[PDB]
Coordinates of C-alpha atoms and ligand atoms in Angstrom, one line a residue:
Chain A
X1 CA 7.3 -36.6 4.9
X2 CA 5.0 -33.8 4.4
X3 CA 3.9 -32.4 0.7
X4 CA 4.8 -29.7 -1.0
X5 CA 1.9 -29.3 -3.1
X6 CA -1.5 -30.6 -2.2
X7 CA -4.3 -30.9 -4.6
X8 CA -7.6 -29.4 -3.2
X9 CA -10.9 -30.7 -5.5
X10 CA -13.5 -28.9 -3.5
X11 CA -12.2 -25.5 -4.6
X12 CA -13.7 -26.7 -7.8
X13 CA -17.4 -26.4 -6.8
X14 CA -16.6 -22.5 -6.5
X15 CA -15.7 -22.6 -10.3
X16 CA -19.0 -25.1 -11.2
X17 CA -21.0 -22.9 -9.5
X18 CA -20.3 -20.0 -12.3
X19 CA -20.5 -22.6 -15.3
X20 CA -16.6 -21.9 -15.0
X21 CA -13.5 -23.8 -15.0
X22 CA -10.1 -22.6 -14.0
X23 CA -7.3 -23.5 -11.4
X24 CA -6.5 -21.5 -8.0
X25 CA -3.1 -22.0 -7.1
X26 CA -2.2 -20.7 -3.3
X27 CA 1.6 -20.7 -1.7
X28 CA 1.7 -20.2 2.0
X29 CA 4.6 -18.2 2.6
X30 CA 5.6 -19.6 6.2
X31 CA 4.5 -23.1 5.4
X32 CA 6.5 -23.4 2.3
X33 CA 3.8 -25.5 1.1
X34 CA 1.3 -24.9 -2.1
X35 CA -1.9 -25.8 -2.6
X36 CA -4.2 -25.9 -6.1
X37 CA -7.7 -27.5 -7.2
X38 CA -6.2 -28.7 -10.4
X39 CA -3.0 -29.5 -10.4
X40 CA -2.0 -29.9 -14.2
X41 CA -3.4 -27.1 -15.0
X42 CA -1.6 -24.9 -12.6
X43 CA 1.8 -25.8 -14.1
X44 CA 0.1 -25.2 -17.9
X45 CA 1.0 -22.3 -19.9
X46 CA -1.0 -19.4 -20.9
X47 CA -0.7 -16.0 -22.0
X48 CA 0.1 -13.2 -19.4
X49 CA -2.1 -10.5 -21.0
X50 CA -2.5 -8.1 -18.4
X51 CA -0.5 -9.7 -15.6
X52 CA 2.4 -8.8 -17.9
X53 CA 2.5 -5.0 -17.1
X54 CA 4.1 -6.5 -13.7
X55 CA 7.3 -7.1 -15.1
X56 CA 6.8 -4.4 -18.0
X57 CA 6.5 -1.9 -15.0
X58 CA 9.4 -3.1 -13.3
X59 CA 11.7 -3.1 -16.5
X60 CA 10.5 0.6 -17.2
X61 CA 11.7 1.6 -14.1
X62 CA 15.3 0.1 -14.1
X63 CA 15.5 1.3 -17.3
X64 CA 14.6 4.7 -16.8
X65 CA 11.6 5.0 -19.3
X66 CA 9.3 5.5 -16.6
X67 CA 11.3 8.4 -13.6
X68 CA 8.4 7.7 -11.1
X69 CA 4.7 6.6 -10.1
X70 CA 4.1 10.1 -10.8
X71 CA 5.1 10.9 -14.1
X72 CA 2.5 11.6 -16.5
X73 CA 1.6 9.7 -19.6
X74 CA -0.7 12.1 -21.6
X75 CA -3.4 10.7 -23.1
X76 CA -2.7 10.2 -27.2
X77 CA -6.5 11.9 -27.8
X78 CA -7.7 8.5 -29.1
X79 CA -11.2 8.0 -27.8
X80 CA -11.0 3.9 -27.4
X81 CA -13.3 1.2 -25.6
X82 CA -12.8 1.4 -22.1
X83 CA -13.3 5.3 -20.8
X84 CA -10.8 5.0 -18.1
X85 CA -8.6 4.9 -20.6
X86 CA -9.3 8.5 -22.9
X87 CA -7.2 10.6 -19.8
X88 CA -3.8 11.1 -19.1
X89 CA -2.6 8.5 -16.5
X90 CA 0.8 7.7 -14.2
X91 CA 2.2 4.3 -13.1
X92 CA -0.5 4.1 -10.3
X93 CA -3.6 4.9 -12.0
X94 CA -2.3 2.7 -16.0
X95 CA -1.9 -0.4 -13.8
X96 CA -5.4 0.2 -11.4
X97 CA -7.7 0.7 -14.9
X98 CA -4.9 -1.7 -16.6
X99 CA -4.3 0.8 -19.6
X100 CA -3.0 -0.8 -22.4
X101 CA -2.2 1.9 -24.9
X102 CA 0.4 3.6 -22.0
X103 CA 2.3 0.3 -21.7
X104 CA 2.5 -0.3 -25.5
X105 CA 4.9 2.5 -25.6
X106 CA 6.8 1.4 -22.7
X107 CA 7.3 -1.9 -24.6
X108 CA 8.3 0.0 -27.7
X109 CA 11.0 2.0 -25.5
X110 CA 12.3 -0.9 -23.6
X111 CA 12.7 -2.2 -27.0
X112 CA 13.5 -6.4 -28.2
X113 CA 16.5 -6.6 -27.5
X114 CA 16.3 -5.3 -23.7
X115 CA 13.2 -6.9 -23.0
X116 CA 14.1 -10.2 -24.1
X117 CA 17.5 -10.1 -21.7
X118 CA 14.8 -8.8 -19.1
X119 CA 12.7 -11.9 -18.9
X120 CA 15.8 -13.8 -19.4
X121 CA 17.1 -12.3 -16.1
X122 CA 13.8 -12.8 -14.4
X123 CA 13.3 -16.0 -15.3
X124 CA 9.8 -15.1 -16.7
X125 CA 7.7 -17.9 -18.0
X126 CA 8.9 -19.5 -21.1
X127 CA 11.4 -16.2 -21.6
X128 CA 9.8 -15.7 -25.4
X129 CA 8.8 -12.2 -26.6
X130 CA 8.6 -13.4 -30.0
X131 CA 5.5 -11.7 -32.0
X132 CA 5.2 -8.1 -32.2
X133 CA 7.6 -6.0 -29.3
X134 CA 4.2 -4.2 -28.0
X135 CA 2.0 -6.8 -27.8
X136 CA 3.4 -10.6 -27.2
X137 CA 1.8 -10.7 -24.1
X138 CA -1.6 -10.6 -25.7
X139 CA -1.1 -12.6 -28.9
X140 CA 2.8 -13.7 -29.2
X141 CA 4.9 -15.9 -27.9
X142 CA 5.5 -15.7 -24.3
X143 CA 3.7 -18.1 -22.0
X144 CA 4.1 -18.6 -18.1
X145 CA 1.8 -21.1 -16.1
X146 CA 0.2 -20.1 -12.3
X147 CA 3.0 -22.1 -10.4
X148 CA 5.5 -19.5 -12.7
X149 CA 3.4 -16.4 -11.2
X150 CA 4.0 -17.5 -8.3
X151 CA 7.2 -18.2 -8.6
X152 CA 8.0 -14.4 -10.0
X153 CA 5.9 -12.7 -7.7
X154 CA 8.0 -14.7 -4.3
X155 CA 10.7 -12.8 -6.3
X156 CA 9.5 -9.6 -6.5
X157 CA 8.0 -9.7 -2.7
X158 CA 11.5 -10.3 -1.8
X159 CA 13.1 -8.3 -3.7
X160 CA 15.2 -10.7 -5.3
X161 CA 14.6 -9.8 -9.1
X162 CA 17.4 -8.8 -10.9
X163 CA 16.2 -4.9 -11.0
X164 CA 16.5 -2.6 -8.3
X165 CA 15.2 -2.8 -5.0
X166 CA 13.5 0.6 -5.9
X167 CA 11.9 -0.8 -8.8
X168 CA 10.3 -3.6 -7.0
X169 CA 9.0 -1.2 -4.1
X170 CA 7.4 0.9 -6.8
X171 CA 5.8 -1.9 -8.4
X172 CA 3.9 -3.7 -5.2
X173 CA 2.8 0.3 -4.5
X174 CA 1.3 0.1 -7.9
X175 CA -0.2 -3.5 -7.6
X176 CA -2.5 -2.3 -4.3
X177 CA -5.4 -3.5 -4.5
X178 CA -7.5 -3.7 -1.5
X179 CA -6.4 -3.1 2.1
X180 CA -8.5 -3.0 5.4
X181 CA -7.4 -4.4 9.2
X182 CA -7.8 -7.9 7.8
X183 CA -5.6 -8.7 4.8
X184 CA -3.6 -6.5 1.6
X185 CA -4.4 -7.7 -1.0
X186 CA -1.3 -6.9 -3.9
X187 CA -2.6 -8.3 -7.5
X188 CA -2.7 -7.8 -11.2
X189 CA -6.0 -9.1 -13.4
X190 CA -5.6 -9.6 -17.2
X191 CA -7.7 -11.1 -19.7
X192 CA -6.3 -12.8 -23.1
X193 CA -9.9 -13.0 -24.8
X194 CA -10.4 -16.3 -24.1
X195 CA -8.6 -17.0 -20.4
X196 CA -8.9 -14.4 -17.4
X197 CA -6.1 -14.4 -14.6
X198 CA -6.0 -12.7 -11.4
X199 CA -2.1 -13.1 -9.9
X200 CA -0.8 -11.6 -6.7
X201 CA -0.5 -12.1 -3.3
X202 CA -2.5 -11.5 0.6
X203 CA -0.7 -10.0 3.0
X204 CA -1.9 -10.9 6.7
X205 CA 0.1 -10.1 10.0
X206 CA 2.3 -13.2 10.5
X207 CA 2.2 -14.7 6.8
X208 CA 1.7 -14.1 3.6
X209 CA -0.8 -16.0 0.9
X210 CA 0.6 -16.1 -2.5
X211 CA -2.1 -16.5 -5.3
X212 CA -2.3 -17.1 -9.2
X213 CA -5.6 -18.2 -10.7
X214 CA -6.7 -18.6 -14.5
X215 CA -9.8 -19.5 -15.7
X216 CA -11.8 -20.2 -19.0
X217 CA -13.5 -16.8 -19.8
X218 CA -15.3 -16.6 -22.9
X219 CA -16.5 -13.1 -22.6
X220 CA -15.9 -10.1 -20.7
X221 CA -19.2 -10.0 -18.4
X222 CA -17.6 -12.8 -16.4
X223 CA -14.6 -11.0 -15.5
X224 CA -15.3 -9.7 -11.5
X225 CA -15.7 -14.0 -11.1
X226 CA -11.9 -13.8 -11.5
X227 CA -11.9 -11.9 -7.9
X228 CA -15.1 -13.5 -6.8
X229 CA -13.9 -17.2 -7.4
X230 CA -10.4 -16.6 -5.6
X231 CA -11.9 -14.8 -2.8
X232 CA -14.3 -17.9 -2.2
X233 CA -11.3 -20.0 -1.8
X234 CA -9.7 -17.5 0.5
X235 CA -12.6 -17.7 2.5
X236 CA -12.4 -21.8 2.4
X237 CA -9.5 -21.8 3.6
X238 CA -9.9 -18.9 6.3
X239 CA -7.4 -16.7 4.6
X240 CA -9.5 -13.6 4.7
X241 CA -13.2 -13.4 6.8
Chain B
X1 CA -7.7 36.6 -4.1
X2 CA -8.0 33.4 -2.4
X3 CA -6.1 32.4 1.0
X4 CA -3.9 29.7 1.5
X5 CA -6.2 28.1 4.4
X6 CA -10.2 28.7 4.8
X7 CA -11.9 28.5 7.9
X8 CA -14.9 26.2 7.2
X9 CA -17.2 26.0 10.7
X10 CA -19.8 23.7 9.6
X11 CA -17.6 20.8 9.9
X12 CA -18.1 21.7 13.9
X13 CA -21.1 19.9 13.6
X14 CA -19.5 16.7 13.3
X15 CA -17.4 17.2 16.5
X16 CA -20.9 18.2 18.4
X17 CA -22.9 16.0 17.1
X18 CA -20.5 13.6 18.9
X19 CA -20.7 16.1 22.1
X20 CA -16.6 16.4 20.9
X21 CA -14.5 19.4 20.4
X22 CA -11.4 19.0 18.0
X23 CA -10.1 20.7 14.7
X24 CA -9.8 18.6 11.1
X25 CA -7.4 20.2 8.8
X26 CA -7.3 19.3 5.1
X27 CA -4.8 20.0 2.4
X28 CA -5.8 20.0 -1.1
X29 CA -2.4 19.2 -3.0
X30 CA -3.3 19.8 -6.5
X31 CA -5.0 22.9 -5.8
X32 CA -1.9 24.5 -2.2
X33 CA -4.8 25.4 -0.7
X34 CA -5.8 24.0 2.7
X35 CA -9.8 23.9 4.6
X36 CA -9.7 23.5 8.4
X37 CA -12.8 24.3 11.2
X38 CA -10.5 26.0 13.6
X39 CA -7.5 27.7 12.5
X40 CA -6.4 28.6 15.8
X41 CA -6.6 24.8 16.6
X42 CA -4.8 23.8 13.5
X43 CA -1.8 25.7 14.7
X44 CA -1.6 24.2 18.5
X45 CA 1.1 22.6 19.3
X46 CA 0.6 19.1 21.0
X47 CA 2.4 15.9 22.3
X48 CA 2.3 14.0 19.0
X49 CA 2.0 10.6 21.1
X50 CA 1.7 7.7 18.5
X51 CA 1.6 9.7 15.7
X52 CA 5.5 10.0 16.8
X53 CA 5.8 6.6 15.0
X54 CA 6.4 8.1 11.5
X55 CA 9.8 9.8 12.0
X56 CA 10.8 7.3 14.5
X57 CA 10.4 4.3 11.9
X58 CA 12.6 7.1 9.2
X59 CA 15.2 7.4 11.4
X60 CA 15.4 3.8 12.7
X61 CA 15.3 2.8 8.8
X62 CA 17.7 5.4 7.9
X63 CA 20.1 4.4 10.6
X64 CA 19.8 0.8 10.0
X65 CA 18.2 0.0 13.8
X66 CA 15.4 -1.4 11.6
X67 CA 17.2 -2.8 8.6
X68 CA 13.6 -3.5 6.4
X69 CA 10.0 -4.2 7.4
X70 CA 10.2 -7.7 7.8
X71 CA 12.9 -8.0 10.5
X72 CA 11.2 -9.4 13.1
X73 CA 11.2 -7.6 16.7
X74 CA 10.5 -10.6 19.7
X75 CA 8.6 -9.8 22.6
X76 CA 10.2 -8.9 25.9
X77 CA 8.0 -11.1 27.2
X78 CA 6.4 -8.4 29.9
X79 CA 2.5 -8.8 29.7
X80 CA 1.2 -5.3 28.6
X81 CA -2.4 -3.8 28.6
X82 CA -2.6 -4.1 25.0
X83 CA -3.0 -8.2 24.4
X84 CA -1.6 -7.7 20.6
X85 CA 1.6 -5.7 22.2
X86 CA 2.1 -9.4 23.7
X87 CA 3.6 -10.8 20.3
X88 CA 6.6 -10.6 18.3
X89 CA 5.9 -7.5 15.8
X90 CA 8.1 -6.5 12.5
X91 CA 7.5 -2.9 11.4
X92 CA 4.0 -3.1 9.7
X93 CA 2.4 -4.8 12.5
X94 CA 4.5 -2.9 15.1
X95 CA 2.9 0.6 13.6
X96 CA -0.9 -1.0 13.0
X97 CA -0.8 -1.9 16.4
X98 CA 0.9 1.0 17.8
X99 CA 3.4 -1.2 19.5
X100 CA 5.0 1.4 22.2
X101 CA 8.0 -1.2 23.2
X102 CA 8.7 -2.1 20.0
X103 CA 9.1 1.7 19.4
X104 CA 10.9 2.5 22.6
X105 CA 13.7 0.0 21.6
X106 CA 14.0 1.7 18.4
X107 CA 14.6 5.1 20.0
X108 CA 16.9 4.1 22.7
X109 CA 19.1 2.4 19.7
X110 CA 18.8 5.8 17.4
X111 CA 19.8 7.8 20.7
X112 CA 19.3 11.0 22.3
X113 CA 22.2 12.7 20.1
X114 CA 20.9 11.3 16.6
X115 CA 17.2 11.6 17.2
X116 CA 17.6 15.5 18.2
X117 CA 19.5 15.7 15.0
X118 CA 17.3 14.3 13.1
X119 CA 14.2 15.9 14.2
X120 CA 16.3 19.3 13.6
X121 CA 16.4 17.9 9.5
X122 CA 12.8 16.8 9.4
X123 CA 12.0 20.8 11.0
X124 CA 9.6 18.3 12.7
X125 CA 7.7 20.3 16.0
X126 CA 9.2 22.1 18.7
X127 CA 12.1 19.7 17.7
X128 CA 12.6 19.2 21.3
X129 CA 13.3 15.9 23.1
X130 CA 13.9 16.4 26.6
X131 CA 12.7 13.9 28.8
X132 CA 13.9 10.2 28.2
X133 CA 14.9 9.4 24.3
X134 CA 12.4 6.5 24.9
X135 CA 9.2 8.7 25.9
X136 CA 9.6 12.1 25.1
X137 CA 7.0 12.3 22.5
X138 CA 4.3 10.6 25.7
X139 CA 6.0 12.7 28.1
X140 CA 8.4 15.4 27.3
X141 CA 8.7 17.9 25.7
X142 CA 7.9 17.6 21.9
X143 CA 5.0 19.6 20.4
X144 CA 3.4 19.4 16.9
X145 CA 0.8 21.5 15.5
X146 CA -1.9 19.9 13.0
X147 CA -0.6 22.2 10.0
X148 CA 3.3 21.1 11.0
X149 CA 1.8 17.3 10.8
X150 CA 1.0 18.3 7.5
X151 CA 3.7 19.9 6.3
X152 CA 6.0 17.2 7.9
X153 CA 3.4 14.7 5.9
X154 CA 3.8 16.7 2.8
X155 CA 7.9 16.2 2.6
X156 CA 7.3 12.2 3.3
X157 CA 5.0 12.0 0.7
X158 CA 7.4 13.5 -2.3
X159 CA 10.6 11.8 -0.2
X160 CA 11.8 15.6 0.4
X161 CA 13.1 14.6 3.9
X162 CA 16.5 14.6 4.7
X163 CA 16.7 10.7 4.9
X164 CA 16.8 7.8 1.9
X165 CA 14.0 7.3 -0.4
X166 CA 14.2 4.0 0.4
X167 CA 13.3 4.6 4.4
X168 CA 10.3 7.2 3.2
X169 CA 8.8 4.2 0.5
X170 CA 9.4 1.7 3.4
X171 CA 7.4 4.2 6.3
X172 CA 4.9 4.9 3.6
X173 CA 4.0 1.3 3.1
X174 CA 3.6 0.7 6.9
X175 CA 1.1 3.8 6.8
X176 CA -1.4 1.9 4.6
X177 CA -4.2 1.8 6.5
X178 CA -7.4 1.1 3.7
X179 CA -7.4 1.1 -0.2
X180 CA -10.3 -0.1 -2.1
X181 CA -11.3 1.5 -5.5
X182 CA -11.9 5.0 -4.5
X183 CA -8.8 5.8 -2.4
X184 CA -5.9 5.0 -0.5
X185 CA -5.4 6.1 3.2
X186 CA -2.5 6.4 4.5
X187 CA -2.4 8.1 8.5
X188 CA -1.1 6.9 12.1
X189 CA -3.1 7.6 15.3
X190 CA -2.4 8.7 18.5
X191 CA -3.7 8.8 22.0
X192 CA -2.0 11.2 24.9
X193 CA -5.0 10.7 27.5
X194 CA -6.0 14.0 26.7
X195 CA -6.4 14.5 22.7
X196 CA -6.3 11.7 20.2
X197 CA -4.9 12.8 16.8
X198 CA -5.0 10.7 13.1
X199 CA -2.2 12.1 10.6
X200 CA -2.2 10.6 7.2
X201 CA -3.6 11.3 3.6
X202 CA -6.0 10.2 1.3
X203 CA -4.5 9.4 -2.2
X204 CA -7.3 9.9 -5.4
X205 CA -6.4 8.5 -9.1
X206 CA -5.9 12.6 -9.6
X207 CA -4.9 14.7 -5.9
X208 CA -3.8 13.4 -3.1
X209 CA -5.4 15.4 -0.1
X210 CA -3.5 15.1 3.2
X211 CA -5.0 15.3 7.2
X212 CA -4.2 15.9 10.6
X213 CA -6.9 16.1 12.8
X214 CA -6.6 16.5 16.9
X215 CA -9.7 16.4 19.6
X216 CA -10.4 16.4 23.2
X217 CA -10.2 12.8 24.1
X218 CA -10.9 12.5 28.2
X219 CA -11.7 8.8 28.0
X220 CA -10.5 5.9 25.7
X221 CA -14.2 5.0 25.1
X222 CA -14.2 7.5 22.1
X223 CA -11.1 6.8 20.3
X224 CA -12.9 5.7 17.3
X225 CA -14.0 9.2 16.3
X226 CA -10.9 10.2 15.9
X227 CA -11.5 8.1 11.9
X228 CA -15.3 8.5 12.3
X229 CA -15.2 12.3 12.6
X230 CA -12.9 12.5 9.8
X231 CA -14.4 10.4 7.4
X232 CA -17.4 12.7 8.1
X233 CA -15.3 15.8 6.9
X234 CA -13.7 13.6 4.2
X235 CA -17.1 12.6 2.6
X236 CA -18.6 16.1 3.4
X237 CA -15.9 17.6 0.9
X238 CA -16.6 14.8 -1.7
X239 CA -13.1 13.5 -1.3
X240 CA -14.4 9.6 -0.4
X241 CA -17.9 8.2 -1.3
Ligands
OP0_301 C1 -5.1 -7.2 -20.3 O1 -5.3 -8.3 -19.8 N1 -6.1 -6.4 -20.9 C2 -6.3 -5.0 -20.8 C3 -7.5 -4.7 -19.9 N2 -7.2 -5.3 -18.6 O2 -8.4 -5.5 -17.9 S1 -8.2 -6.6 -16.8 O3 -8.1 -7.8 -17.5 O4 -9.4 -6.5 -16.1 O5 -7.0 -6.2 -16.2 C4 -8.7 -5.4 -20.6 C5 -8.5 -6.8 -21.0 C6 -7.1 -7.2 -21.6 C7 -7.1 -6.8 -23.1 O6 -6.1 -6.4 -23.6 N3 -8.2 -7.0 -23.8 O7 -8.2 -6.7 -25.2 C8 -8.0 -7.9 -26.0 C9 -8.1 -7.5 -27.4 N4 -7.1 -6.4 -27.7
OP0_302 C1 0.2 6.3 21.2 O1 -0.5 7.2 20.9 N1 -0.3 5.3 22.0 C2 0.1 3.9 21.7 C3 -1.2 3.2 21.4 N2 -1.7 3.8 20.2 O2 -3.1 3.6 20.0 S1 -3.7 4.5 18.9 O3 -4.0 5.8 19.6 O4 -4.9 3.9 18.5 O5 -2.7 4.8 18.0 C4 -2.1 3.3 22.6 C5 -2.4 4.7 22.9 C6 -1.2 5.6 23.1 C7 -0.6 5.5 24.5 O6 -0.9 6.3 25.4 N3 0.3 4.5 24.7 O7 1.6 5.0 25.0 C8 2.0 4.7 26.4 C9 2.2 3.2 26.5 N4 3.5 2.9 27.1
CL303 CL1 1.7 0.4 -0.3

């Protein structure tokens, strides 16, 4: 019979040609059939870091801590690192320039205890918010591998997370990323200091191309090869043009 | 003190440089003030042809016709004009492709009693449908003016119409017609062998400024100025790169 997963080597030379190392992982949707240039490591464990404020966003929502896309999160006055980030922001715009400091206090009002039942109910990763309540995505416990992306985000496309429908249609608004008469592209990037991911999915007119890529990514000049590297192997494979 | 629209001519020079005549009106959101070339022209009332393809999808949504955007609509199997008409559709690809059957069905399952009623909640046009319930807006007798496009846009954007938010969220997405970096469009077009109209908005990380534009279209040959002209306005006003 046929196979579910297929390993795919060449991807790799789109990786080598950086000086980079990472693992695409790709799930067509009507084929119900995956296919990754590395197959350990996409079924290894990592931090979210950024890709977490998916199902941060969607547990402020249920909850109530966040009405809307369009409520306003002022800025705190605290001139930080990344510009984008000294302004007052909503939903849309604190997952576009990923704004940390605005989804630190949705952590903090989600709280442990809801947080934890959560990712239990989502079957997030390895379910573990241990380490600090606003920050165990970046430097705590919780760990979820590409083939566990994937898994969440089929969820979420569907609308089969254990949150309201309303919640998840808010979210994939706030994950657009690119669109054109080709392809949508729906996605989260994050970066953990030492690993980049870029997590999401392509939508095209009869299917859709699930993605979850992580790579080794030792500084923050690499970071658009996150994109780059991923849309090479949509290209490969003819997904997008 | 300032009016509520301003007459701005030199955007004519966009329509003649194309040896066109038309009207672009713009809505400023943040600031309730709108810009148009012709204000006589913005308040014209025409056959909304394709652009009738937003309140049909809310009503078909909001009566359950269409029970999400993934339900798949097969071909009749009558070969049309339009070779990507020829296919099945689901509502995304059905509104990108401006799939009149596909929409005809739907209005022939909402009916001639609902959709009048309907129409009479969204204060959408003339509000009239005679003619068939399955061409009125291609035939009958159904007007819209440009600044009634916007308002009608206006209420879909905040979900202020008289159906579910889930229908609105639902239509919205199968507006998307670009994103990138800089801004989200969002519009439907329309061709009635006379004028060709785009309806739609352009969302920014900090306004959203909504559209409706209408020109003199004797010839399908031109039907890409409809986007070309207003992109010109659009970049004119700094609103897109
Ligand atoms: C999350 O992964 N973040 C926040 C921000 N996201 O940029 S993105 O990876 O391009 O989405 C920058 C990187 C990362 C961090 O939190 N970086 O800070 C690490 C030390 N606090
Ligand atoms: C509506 O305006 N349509 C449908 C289709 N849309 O093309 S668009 O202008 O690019 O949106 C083709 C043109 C126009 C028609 O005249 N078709 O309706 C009659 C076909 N039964
Ligand atoms: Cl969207």
């Amino acid at each position: 019979g046929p196979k579910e997963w297929q390993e795919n080597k060449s991807w790799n030379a789109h990786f080598t040609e950086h000086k980079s190392q990472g693992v695409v992982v790709l799930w067509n949707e009507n084929k119900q059939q995956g296919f990754t240039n590395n197959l350990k490591r996409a079924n290894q464990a990592f931090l979210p870091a950024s890709t977490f404020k998916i199902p941060n966003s969607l547990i402020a929502l249920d909850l109530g801590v966040v009405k809307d896309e369009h409520q306003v999160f002022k800025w705190d006055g605290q001139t930080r690192d990344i510009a984008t980030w000294n302004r007052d922001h909503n939903l849309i715009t604190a997952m576009k320039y990923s704004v940390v400091p605005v989804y630190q206090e949705f952590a903090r009002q989600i709280g442990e205890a809801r947080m934890s039942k959560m990712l239990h109910a989502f079957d997030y990763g390895n379910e573990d918010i241990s380490g600090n309540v606003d920050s165990f995505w970046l430097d705590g416990g919780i760990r979820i591998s590409a083939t566990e992306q994937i898994s969440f985000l089929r969820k979420l496309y569907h609308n089969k997370l254990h949150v309201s429908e309303r919640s998840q249609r808010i979210v994939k608004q706030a994950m657009l990323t690119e669109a054109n008469g080709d392809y949508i592209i729906r996605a989260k990037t994050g970066y953990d200091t030492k690993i980049g991911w870029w997590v999401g999915w392509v939508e095209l007119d009869d299917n859709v191309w699930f993605f979850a890529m992580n790579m080794d990514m030792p500084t923050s000049d690499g970071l658009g090869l996150r994109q780059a590297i991923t849309k090479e192997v949509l290209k490969q494979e003819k997904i997008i043009p």
